[PDB]
Amino acid sequence: TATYSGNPFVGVTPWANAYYASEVSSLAIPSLTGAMATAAAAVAKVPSFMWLDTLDKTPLMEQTLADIRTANKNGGNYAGQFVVYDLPDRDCAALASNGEYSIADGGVAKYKNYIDTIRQIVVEYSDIRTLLVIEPASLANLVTNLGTPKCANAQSAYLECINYAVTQLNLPNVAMYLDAGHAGWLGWPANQDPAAQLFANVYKNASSPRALRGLATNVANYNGWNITSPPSYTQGNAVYNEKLYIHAIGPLLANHGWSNAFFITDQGRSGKQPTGQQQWGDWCNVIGTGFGIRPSANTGDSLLDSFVWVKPGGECDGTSDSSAPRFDSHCALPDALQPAPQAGAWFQAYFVQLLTNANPSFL
Numbered sequence: 493t494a495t496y497s498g499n500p501f502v503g504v505t506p507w508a509n510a511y512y513a514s515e516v517s518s519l520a521i522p523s524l525t526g527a528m529a530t531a532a533a534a535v536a537k538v539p540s541f542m543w544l545d546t547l548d549k550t551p552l553m554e555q556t557l558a559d560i561r562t563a564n565k566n567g568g569n570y571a572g573q574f575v576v577y578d579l580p581d582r583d584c585a586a587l588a589s590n591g592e593y594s595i596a597d598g599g600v601a602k603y604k605n606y607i608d609t610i611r612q613i614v615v616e617y618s619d620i621r622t623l624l625v626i627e628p629a630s631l632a633n634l635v636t637n638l639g640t641p642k643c644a645n646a647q648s649a650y651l652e653c654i655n656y657a658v659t660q661l662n663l664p665n666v667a668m669y670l671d672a673g674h675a676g677w678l679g680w681p682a683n684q685d686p687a688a689q690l691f692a693n694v695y696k697n698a699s700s701p702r703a704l705r706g707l708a709t710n711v712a713n714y715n716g717w718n719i720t721s722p723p724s725y726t727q728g729n730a731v732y733n734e735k736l737y738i739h740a741i742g743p744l745l746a747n748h749g750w751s752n753a754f755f756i757t758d759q760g761r762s763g764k765q766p767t768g769q770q771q772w773g774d775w776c777n778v779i780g781t782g783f784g785i786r787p788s789a790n791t792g793d794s795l796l797d798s799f800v801w802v803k804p805g806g807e808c809d810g811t812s813d814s815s816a817p818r819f820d821s822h823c824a825l826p827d828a829l830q831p832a833p834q835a836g837a838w839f840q841a842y843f844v845q846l847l848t849n850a851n852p853s854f855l
């Protein structure tokens with residue numbers, strides 16, 4: 493059944509979508525032989541979130557859901573996972589993932605249509621549990637980057653927009669998780685309370701929506717879950733892994749008006765610890781990373797509903813071509829794999845490194 497009570501990941505199975513499947517079978521496999529080609533085909537069977545990074549991405553959402561309903565009618569129990577990521581003046585603290593909507597050019601109204609569209613789809617397929625991650629790298633920027641004009645000037649729109657999203661998608665078959673950065677971002681002591689206040693406020697201001705089950709951490713990043721050895725680049729922070737991060741922020745959300753908040757953590761590129769990050773603040777196509785802990789709700793943790801793979805390994809994080817559009821200097825750094833295509837584009841060399849460093853291994 494679609495509606496739930498408790499951890500939305502219990503009583504359903506995460507669906508591996510066709511989009512990622514297609515990327516691995518028609519962009520990476522034809523370029524591998526023997527073992528690798530057989531391992532890669534397995535990777536595409538692991539469930540990961542489909543990003544709705546553009547309005548014209550919604551048709552694919554409807555089709556993926558179209559497939560699920562089908563499998564579910566033939567004795568199957570699957571749920572859909574998608575990332576809502578199309579905020580006006582998106583990624584305000586960086587340049588690599590600039591989006592299709594801008595506040596100046598009627599961006600807020602366009603986002604409201606963007607959410608309306610999506611709502612109509614979850615409405616149409618109310619017979620399917622739909623798990624959602626809401627706007628990665630947005631509220632987290634309001635906490636630490638008000639010093640960047642683009643973020644400060646976008647504060648009003650972000651808030652308005654996110655509130656429209658969380659309330660407009662507040663439905664019985666929906667489970668939302670607001671993105672909350674990660675250990676290296678807001679895990680720092682002085683960033684903790686302020687973040688807690690921010691998410692608590694978003695939640696309460698939306699009238700404590702039932703579908704809003706909690707926060708998502710490490711989305712598109714590489715922090716480890718419960719490593720017992722602090723990596724060198726985390727020097728100076730006692731919260732150096734995601735477990736320590738959610739157990740530190742959980743009680744604080746409760747302090748500010750949000751009880752029973754749970755978490756899901758991205759481990760799609762965490763398998764290899766430590767990473768080749770020269771610095772903890774380097775986020776672009778980091779070297780020395782592999783597929784990590786596989787998706788599952790048997791977390792062994794009181795606050796984690798499930799391990800997840802939100803950022804699909806192999807899909808670039810940004811170009812390293814100084815001449816190309818949307819060039820973020822972070823993607824030309826020594827710890828970044830080069831040369832890199834545009835963000836969202838398939839990155840064959842990266843996908844191979846992840847397969848070779850998978851842990852659990854695929855080989």
Ligand SMILES: *[C@@H]1O[C@H](CO)[C@@H](O)[C@H](O)[C@H]1NC(C)=O
Nearest residue numbers: 648651652655693694697698
């Ligand atoms: C609260 O919700 C209103 C919409 O009624 C929105 O305009 C405002 O920006 C929101 N504030 C916060 C802090 O989320």
Ligand SMILES: *[C@@H]1O[C@H](CO)[C@@H](O)[C@H](O)[C@H]1NC(C)=O
Nearest residue numbers: 717718719720785790791792
């Ligand atoms: C970390 O989590 C994994 C999966 O939940 C578990 O198998 C492993 O034993 C944990 N490590 C520690 C030190 O708790």
Ligand SMILES: OC[C@H]1O[C@@H](O)[C@H](O)[C@@H](O)[C@@H]1O
Nearest residue numbers: 585586629677711712713775
């Ligand atoms: O793509 C998401 C990335 O955006 C960057 O602007 C953030 O600084 C980084 O921490 C995050 O992982």
Ligand SMILES: OC[C@H]1O[C@@H](O)[C@H](O)[C@@H](O)[C@@H]1O
Nearest residue numbers: 543545589712804807835836
């Ligand atoms: O693979 C998903 C990717 O979608 C892109 O549209 C985003 O710019 C990027 O940040 C994200 O990682």
Ligand SMILES: *[C@@H]1O[C@H](CO)[C@@H](O)[C@H](O)[C@@H]1O
Nearest residue numbers: 519520522523524840841
């Ligand atoms: C798989 O195929 C693509 C396109 O030919 C290459 O770019 C890649 O290196 C691999 O051979």
Ligand SMILES: *[C@H]1O[C@H](CO)[C@@H](O)[C@H](O)[C@@H]1O
Nearest residue numbers: 493494495496497664665
């Ligand atoms: C999910 O919620 C619906 C409506 O509340 C129930 O009918 C169902 O049994 C499950 O609890």
Ligand SMILES: *[C@H]1O[C@H](CO)[C@@H](O)[C@H](O)[C@@H]1O
Nearest residue numbers: 503504505506568569570
């Ligand atoms: C979703 O599908 C998986 C694999 O078929 C099951 O193990 C689970 O119980 C649910 O039906």
Ligand SMILES: *[C@H]1O[C@H](CO)[C@@H](O)[C@H](O)[C@@H]1O
Nearest residue numbers: 510511512514515518519
């Ligand atoms: C399946 O879909 C992917 C899109 O991710 C394409 O790259 C591929 O060519 C095929 O159409």
Ligand SMILES: *[C@H]1O[C@H](CO)[C@@H](O)[C@H](O)[C@@H]1O
Nearest residue numbers: 513516517533534536537
């Ligand atoms: C892409 O398609 C191939 C078969 O054509 C699969 O083996 C792979 O798992 C992915 O779905």
Ligand SMILES: *[C@H]1O[C@H](CO)[C@@H](O)[C@H](O)[C@@H]1O
Nearest residue numbers: 513514515516517518519
């Ligand atoms: C990947 O995409 C190609 C078309 O470009 C298909 O032929 C293949 O089956 C897979 O879906």
Ligand SMILES: *[C@H]1O[C@H](CO)[C@@H](O)[C@H](O)[C@@H]1O
Nearest residue numbers: 525526527528529530531
């Ligand atoms: C990967 O390994 C399998 C072994 O079962 C082969 O069938 C496949 O062709 C590829 O070499």
